Amino acid sequence: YDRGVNTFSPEGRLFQVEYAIEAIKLGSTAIGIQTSEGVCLAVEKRITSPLMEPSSIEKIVEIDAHIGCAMSGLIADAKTLIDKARVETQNHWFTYNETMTVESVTQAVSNLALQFGEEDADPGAMSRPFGVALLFGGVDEKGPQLFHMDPSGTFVQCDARAIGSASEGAQSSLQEVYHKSMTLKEAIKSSLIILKQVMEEKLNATNIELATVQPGQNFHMFTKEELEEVIKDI
Amino acid sequence: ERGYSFSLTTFSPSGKLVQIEYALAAVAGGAPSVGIKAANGVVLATEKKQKSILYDERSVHKVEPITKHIGLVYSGMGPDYRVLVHRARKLAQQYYLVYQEPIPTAQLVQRVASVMQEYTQSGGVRPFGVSLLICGWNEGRPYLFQSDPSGAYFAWKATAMGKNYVNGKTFLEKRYNEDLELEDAIHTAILTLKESFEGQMTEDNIEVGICNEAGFRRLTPTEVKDYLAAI
Amino acid sequence: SYDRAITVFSPDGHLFQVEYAQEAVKKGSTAVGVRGRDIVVLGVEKKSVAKLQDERTVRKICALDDNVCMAFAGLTADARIVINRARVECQSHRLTVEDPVTVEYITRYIASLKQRYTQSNGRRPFGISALIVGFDFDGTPRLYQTDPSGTYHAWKANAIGRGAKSVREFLEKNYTDEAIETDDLTIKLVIKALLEVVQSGGKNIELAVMRRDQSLKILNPEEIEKYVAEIEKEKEENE
Amino acid sequence: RNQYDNDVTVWSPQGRIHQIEYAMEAVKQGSATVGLKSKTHAVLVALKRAQSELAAHQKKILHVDNHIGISIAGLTADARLLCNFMRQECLDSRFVFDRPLPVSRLVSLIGSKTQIPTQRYGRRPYGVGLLIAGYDDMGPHIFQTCPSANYFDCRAMSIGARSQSARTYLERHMSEFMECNLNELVKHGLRALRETLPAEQDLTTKNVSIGIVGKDLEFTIYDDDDVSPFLEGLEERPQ
Amino acid sequence: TGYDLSASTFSPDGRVFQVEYAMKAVENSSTAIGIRCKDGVVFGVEKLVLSKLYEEGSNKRLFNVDRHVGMAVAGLLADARSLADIAREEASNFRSNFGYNIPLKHLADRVAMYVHAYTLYSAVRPFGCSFMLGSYSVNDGAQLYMIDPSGVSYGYWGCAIGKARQAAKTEIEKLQMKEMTCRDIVKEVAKIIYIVHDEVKDKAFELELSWVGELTNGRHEIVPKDIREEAEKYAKESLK
Amino acid sequence: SRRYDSRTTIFSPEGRLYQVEYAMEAIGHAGTCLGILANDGVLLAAERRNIHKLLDEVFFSEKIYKLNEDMACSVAGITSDANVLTNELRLIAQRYLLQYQEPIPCEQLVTALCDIKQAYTQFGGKRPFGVSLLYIGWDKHYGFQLYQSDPSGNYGGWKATCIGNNSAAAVSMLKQDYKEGEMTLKSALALAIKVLNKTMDVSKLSAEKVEIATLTRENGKTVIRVLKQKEVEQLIKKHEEEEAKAEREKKEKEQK
Amino acid sequence: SSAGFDRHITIFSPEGRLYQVEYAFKAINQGGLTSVAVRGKDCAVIVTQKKVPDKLLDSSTVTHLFKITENIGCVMTGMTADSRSQVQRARYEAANWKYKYGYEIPVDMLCKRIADISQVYTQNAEMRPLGCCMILIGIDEEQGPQVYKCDPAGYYCGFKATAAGVKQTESTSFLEKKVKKKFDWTFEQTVETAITCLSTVLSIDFKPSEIEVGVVTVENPKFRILTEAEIDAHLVALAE
Amino acid sequence: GVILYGPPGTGKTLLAKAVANQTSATFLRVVGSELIQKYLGDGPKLVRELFRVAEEHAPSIVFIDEIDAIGTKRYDSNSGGEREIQRTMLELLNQLDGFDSRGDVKVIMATNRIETLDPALIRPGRIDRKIEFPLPDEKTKKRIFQIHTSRMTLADDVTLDDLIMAKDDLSGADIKAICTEAGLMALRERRMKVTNEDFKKSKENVLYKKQEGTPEGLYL
């Protein structure tokens, strides 16, 4: 009835990491699109009440000045991963006088993604896997790269991935409208077109937040009142 | 090693510790004992019944001293008795090292009670299964205390423990009273041990340790031999 | 040491022990809180006076610093520990960078502490859901709500405890601009929101305000009875 | 009601540990890799797989040292942990003795490493399986590791899902492996690997990777750019 | 039911079922035979392949603890390697902190206590290995010991460990090992291995032998490959 | 291993703690104690659970434990498990006196011991401390204080309390028969005797099953006194006459 | 009459008994051997039969007559591995006492240390209670010969003549009638009684190659193991 | 199927007795406490015979009061009668809708709890009308007090509005418990009809009967 945190299934996969995979679609959706001139991100805030201030809920958290992130799942669990990724980027800059590649910081944040233990030592080591999937986007040295991380620690490169509750619907709607030769405004318009029918509420300039990382502009722009330029076109 | 570190003595839904009552039932199926504090010293008596004549009676002992004026007897399990005897001896030696005075019996009783309590509460270990009876003549007045496996302690003028102890308690309440002397306390302790003993009662069967103002003395077989006659 | 997993993922996906600990919050006393443009007003309910018990040792509103106030729900035993840890962290921040503690920073600290208590092994999750109200040293005041999961959110009007849904539905359409235009109207709105529970008036409400840039002042029940009296007098005309 | 198969400490009445067999079921769910050798070369060819239509293919071959190159099938975090152990051991060997590490004592080290978690309490077996190619002083070697920590000194073998066709091909084309050059050996490796695939699609130069070590050749990994010289000159699938 | 889960749980009959299940896992392996003589100790292990899964010398079951100590294992593998490194560590520690070579009785006793230290607690599981320990010295003669996973070590003039053990000890009992030398007892060991092995069910058998003795002047080494090892031809001559 | 664990940390399916309540039920019987204050002087009244005739009584101590120059504590529940708590709070008080060189206030000592009691229910996997005790004391800031405590670490100030046996009727009679700020230390003793006559089922209780300890204040001394059996007898008698006095109102009125 | 985990871990039953030591006693008589110790006026003797069911097994390493110290001897019953672990622990504690306190450790203090070690095994609930027995013999100045028997439950006691193993009840029933008439208990009388106890309990009339006799005495305190010649002499002197 | 759930004492079965007077066909009441048997086999036989009698008679209605006592969960599967209850409910699950569903038989089920129920019962096809029973705070409590005090006297000094004014946590079983006991003081003292203090001490004692010893000094 009750088994340990490290237990293999009779069919052989696992018995706790697949439950963390099952907790992914209880969160909000997040779409990241990589294009040859920049990496665009978008997310759903999923407001509940008008009394809640909408600017408090953040999903797009920057790690380095050239690297973004996007969440799906339990935000409090992913805060530790984002803080650790910030620590690794600053340590690698301090010890090597150059910026991290986004693959290296994804590897550094995925090394400790599967480290739960009961027999293990330390001052309270993780007892359960983190229940988040993270999207990273950046322009390190080969240009625009987008990466996806899942609770099993597997990281892969994706051209245009969507995670969350309606991940399969947004993926199947992302299959047809995509090509390698497109631009950033077309990418933002297509991602907003996909996010139109996914959400159960009505879209405005306060229910979503988007962020674009380019080789030219250092951080990511498009806060409020800049979203209204592309919302009224949709 | 393993290192359990989880406490397996938990509260019942009725609001009690079941393991403490089970240990007390283990005590109640033990060897009988009696302890009488009467106006000059304390007398402790018990029963050593061997299963065969091939045993050596003088090898093991049950009235085990602790200091020059503190004695101890028990009712319960034998293996769980030498451990707390050794712990009480070491603790009394630590007290004598610190304060340079023979240890008063009351403080010994509280510290062995605290040892029993932390064995009940701590992780991975079972509670003790032995009720103690600690005697001693400190600062003039004799003292007789009893500590149960719950880790508490009481104070008795005259008490009994082990198998068939409620009728021994009624015997001590009826036959004895507030003021006796030492010798007739030995007599009535021998009688209340004889109320549940076998057909014979020699020095090889019963073992009596007395205390007084001249120090704790475990009785020789000769003294118990002439005491057991016509008594 | 008791290294053993307590918080374990359920087969159907959601975490179990955190949503076990939400019911402790939901079985506690109610506490509401609003902010305005000059004053903030937070008020607990169900004081449960017993006529022979001291009222100063049963308090639910505390001062983490001169500009931060907090009202919890649920069981108070974990709440006192979280209060003391927050005070230690606030004073340690003041021994660092000399500015006083921002209200958002202490909510982030409390949420991170609660998360690290839920994540690690051999530790029961906390059973409180705090309400952190205060005005920082740059202007606009704000209030936040935490959770045993550790998800803080900034609000403008919130309520916790046994009956939080009714007060939230009452505040769904009451927070107008003229209700927060003055100071006495905010306290009247707090009293009208707490009147949806308790339903005695002037004896189960322990509302406290922060005036402006000033330390907290727990309201004497005489002026609380005056506020309840004028709130009752303003609700007489219906035709 | 099942019993005996929830931890590595408990044996079975039949006398086996079912968790180790479950780790074998885990390691046979990865993609098929083939490793083989000649008298002067050691080549492992691995088949990448696609998790989605537009997502990139996960790489399999990754270099450990100047002469040891490992493949992978199974998990990924434990793969990175074991690969970090190989890297650290090779660095310590080149730092202390200033010589290349032989592959046999390296896999003995990894067997002694992986046998520790399958004897204690609460430690899972490592759910990975490695194909290790290396050119030490006496011949090239291709080795295979199992989650039971039974390493086998194989000569030409395949691992992963649907590897029995590759094993039968390597059995029926075994003897002419040492007398041939590298170019024919690589084509033999791809002919062994293509039997894993169903007879509809082929090796489309974006789901395959080839790693070669040799006597004077550095351990090189080719994926999607230098693969195309090896795909040309291949016969079509007999169907 | 429930007494067979942990090692620190006694059965109603007084048994410990975990070491019994360890012995059940032990007897599923292949046969390993060791014969003591007047001048040395010969080992013999019937290695099993499946199709290849091996080269010549792969999945070796003849280990080497020290210069004079030989070790032949039979049971669940990768615990044999752990016990081999354990016995190597005891031999190296004895050489470092006592000067001379480790006697076989002391080493077998030490490894037997290390095996017995695992069938006491509930955290660890008992081993699934039952090896042999043979050596030859001038001042101590030739010795052979056998250790079971329960942790019992006995001396033996000849023993067999594995699946076909009860069908192999009788063939050891046929010969008189107190008088023969090494050069005929190697072919007797090969004949015993060829008799005790069934070819209908496996058909993928291969011998490996060993040597301690005065022929290998007090050192452990494998019989010289293509030179000798024609005892397989002799056993094929003794097919009936 | 793991199946042998008793699981003394997890909540229950209704969401309320499931092990502390059994300790509170254990406190709910086996003992009776109360405390009263409304002016100078604060009293503690306790009931002897064991009144066997072979007890020496020369131990000069009871459930009433002295711990400081200006405090007292009375325990309830498991007697074995209260020595640890009393020694711990005595150590806390002496550590405060070593540090700040002033006697410890009541609030800090009660909160420190309540944090220590809460630490076992928060984590550690051990059984909770099955003791609920009651403090009386004097302070510079607030004068005479009475404090209750629970095994869960909850605490609170009080003026008339309840810690022992069946006493909801005692709580009701403490509500009904209490005065505010007029309790000199001669009517509070009579109130305690009147309450303890009704909580215990033994009618016409003697000075063997009742213990009264008062904390008063001299000119800078804070005298903690345990009342001897010579005065407790006539203190009981002064209430024993009051029942016969109160029954005379229904005797001289029914005459027509 | 259990309480869920009454069978498995060392805890108290509702009847007051703790069951793990009672299930561990069956490990003493599971082994199938019987050992008798007899103390006389100036000697103490140990008799134990040994079983050698196979001719290839070495007959010089079967013996349970272990030597603790040069004047302190012991014998075992039960599981052999726990017996050897207790042997090594007793040797270590005797050497530690001889290093610490300057003089030779008495037999009763060694038995007390062994019993105190075994008590922690039944105190905690994480170790197997180590089901093997203990019989120690020695000589102590101004006390004569001493014989002691420890227990897996940690109960040690002195004895005059006692046996452990499988046939304890019948051997003690015969031995009580033998000791009840206190006759001249010399050396030949003690070895004759110790041999005839097993001879009358088992009724086998054993050959001298299957009986091990250990001796300690006041004429020389050194522990001696009797070889087959003196066993031959005593057995032909026993037969009238 | 109609299922009625709520807090323990609200309207549960009561309402079920009130609907069994306006009905036209016959009404069969069974209790879940009766639906255990010490003999292994009479469990599912009694359930089968219950529905066979009800089907052949008329368009009857079967009311299984306290059905949550048996069909709560199946995850235990430990030997004894605690798994026999799982076996005696599986026949009820099969006979409700498992093959050729019976015409003109209407079932109605009363529970105390929701979450500890088998989800194969919870699915549609067997019960559809999930009915919630909340506790009325003051409005119908006037009418409950109007009904319960209708067939008795009432004086001018006793009025029931202030007794429930500050309290919003009662139930309809307790109100009848108040009104039956408030008439019991007047009969036992041989006093007048109703006094106001009759209602005052009835509220305090019924509170003692409803909330006596719950260990909540720590508010969760």
Ligand SMILES: Nc1ncnc2c1ncn2[C@@H]1O[C@H](COP(=O)(O)OP(=O)(O)O)[C@@H](O)[C@H]1O
């Ligand atoms: N609204 C009401 N009107 C009249 N009586 C009521 C009302 N609500 C509850 N009661 C009384 O409460 C009792 C409990 O009803 P019910 O909840 O069906 O029983 P149970 O609590 O045993 O399941 C009934 O006897 C009924 O008389």
